[model samples]
Target: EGESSISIGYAQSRVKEDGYKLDKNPRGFNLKYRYEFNNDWGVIGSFAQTRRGFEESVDGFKLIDGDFKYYSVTAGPVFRINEYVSLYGLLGAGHGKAKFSSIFGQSESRSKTSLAYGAGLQFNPHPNFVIDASYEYSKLDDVKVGTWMLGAGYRF
Candidate 1:
């Protein structure tokens, strides 16, 4: 029997910060690959990208309007709860760049890399098809980013 699968899906991310209001929930995409060595244990790897927009103000004055683009990669262990469900966790690193534009039309950009971690649940509706829901978090220096994702794929 085959023991590997590849999945692709959509993701939404939010920046966790004070004094910042989001324009909307950021949208993104994710890809994952998994391999099982036995009936109860396996390994998983993931890649994801997201873009965010927000506005920050101080003392009733708008400080800046900003946009951020982020990407991450992670790998970890997965444990099957049974034939229908599984639980997993991941750890890795992420890189992000942000562009901040002020009311005076001045703009600046900065980029950073940071450590990340996450956990999630996976489901198997059928032997050939898999679905998963997961959460991931990363901090680029002072800014913290959290993402939620759902995915579907075929096992081969």
Candidate 2:
């Protein structure tokens, strides 16, 4: 009766750059589904997307201005710790994109796909309700991004 569940939640991400700080962190949403085959093992899948505005300037000159976006999908195994808690790990693929314009009136957009992986935990306070928190990391071309998510779900 409680073998299947679906959920949605908010996600925030940080981009790793060598020598610059992002003007804003990416914010988005994620959706998840899980099916337990038995008492201790299950399969889980998830989708997430995030976007943010970014700017880089030197002194009084603007060097870059644009938006960055990321989307990902993952599936893996879930392990139940007990009746109230569970843990899971995922491996999948992700796409990261950046669209920006420079001072020379040149605009460019670039996107790439890479391997993604993460792990998370779930808390069940009721038979039909769940609270989840997770983190994932991916690198697309030359960019590396890490995301954190929190959400709620219903079991059916």
Candidate 3:
């Protein structure tokens, strides 16, 4: 009966520029699925997306706009710690594109490819539903990002 498990949650990320203090804070959503192979292990996959923006202040309250979006997908192994607990670890890679949408013009920075990794703990609060919390990291060369998230999922 290890056919399907659906999970969803919220994530917050802090992105830093190379050797700079300009930080972008993003709020996002996490969605995932898991299929158990046996009692102690399973196959896991996930996707997440986030968006944030910056605004230039105006002396007379006019606003200038700038924004960015981040998205990724990861898959790997998930291990059960016990009947009520499970741990997931992934060593996968993904790509991300950051864009600045401006009225004058648009500028975008896209990663050729990047490494993604995460560790998560799941706790069962009911027979078919559980809560998940995780720490995930992504890197595109020297520029890196870290995110923390908590979500709920339905067990298989």
lDDT of 2: 0.80
Q: How does candidate 3 score on lDDT?
A: 0.73
Could you report the Cα RMSD, in angstroms, for every candidate shown? 6.0, 5.0, 4.2
Off by over 4 Å in 3: 18-23, 53-65, 100-112
lDDT string for model 1 (1-156, tens) is: 438989888988776655345434566789999898877888898888776655455644544434667888888899988879899998888887776655566656888888889997899999898898878888665777787889887888
**How far off is residue 67 in model 1, in Å?**
5.8
Q: What TM-score would every model get versus the actual structure?
A: 0.75, 0.77, 0.76
Question: Order of all candidates by TM-score, from best down to worst?
Answer: 2, 3, 1
- Score residue 78 of candidate 2 by CA lDDT: 88
After aligning candidate 1 to the native by TM-score, how far in Å is the CA of 124 from where it should be?
A: 1.1
lDDT of 1: 0.79
Model 2, span 1-156: residue lDDT tens:
348889899988787664334444677899999888887888888899876644455645644434567898888898989889899997888887876554566666887788888898899999899998878888666677787889998988
Model 3, TM vs. native: 0.76
Please report, as a residue range, the 10-residue window in candidate 3 with the lowest summed lDDT.
Answer: 59-68
